[PDB]
Each structure stands twice: as structure tokens, then as C-alpha cells.
Amino acid sequence: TPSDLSESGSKLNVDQFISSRQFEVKQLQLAMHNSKAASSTRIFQALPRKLRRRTASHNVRRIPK
Amino acid sequence: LAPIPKGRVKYTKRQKHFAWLPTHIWNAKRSHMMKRWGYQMVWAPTQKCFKLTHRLGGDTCSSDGALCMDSSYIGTIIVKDKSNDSEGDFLKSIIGKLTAERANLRKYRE
């Protein structure tokens, strides 16, 4: 079970989630890059600051009085 | 003189002096707003684009992009001659009086 039920809500563990799905990730990486899969360098670069955004709050909203 | 249109009562009640562009909310959420000549136009976007406009819209060669301007604030009049449904000999003199005869020439007409 990648997710279980606990005290507050449901807990999802990244460990087993990516452990059980490993060969699928390998096949995905092989389908994306063929000759660069054997190499280990920087393919993905930093996101431009123009496209960079900011994080909002976790609440819904505050109504006017 | 045509009045302001009928959009949303809430937003229409806000202006009451300066009309709103059909992209007012978008520009206000993207660029800055100001109200000078009975209207509300854009001043400048949040991100600085001094050197960006030069390399994009200017006379430069290395310009890979485009710039879009909401220029709906520019008001226009359509004039038609109803003295007859034929050549506008009245509109000729009207334009020659309104602007210099540069406007009233064979090039801009033909």
C-alpha cells in the first residue's frame, strides 16, 4: 500500500511509492533519452525568472466583515 | 456622443468617470493602471522591459518576438457624405480644413 490511513488523514510514503515503480521510471528515462541515459550530466536547466511564480497560502480566503 | 457600454453592474459602477478597455482586468492584473484623460490605460508591466522592448520592437535585427499594445483608447470618427451617394466634394474641403492638404491628396485617396 503506497498510501495508508492514520491519525489525521491519509499518509503517502515516497519511499515505497518510488521503490515499487522503478523499472517503469527506467523505461521512461530510456524512452526520453537514448544515448544520454548512459551519461550522467546536467540536461534540465534552471527555470527562467520570468516564468518563476510565487506560492500562495493554504487557506481558502478571508471574507470582508 | 456614445455612452459607456453595459457590462457588469458591479464593475460598471466602479469607473463612473473613466471608461474601461475590454481587457481592463487582464492588464490591471499584469500592468499598472492610471486615469488621466477620462480613460484608464496601461502605464507599464510589473517586470522591467527597458532593454527588452529595444531588442524586440526596435529597429534591431536580432528581434525574435512580438509586442502587443491595447490601443483601444484611441477614439475614432467615421464621416460619410450624405449630400449625395457619390464623390465627396464636401468631404474633400472638410478634410482640407481639418488637416493640411497633405491629407487631401491623390495618393491617400486613390
Binding site: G9, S10, L12, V14, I18, Q22, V25, R42, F44, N59 | -
Partner: protein, 38 residues
């Protein structure tokens, strides 16, 4: 988790430039909380 951590490191070495940055500064949370905010 050891081979799992090796897989995560070989995955982070493609996106990030320093693979042992988050594990050293403790940014890889082992638990994902899923609950409506109360």
C-alpha cells in the same frame, strides 16, 4: 531505503547539480501529509 536512496540520488543528479544537497539539508520529506486544512 539504501538502494532507494541510490535511485533518488541518480535521479537528482540529472535535474540538480549537487545530488547530496537536499539529503544533507533535509529537504526530502519521507512523509506526504494528505488532509484538508483544519
Amino acid at each position: 531505503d539504501r538502494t532507494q536512496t541510490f535511485i533518488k540520488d541518480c535521479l537528482f543528479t540529472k535535474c540538480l547539480e549537487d545530488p547530496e544537497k537536499p539529503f544533507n539539508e533535509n529537504r526530502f520529506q519521507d512523509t506526504l501529509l494528505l488532509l484538508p486544512t483544519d
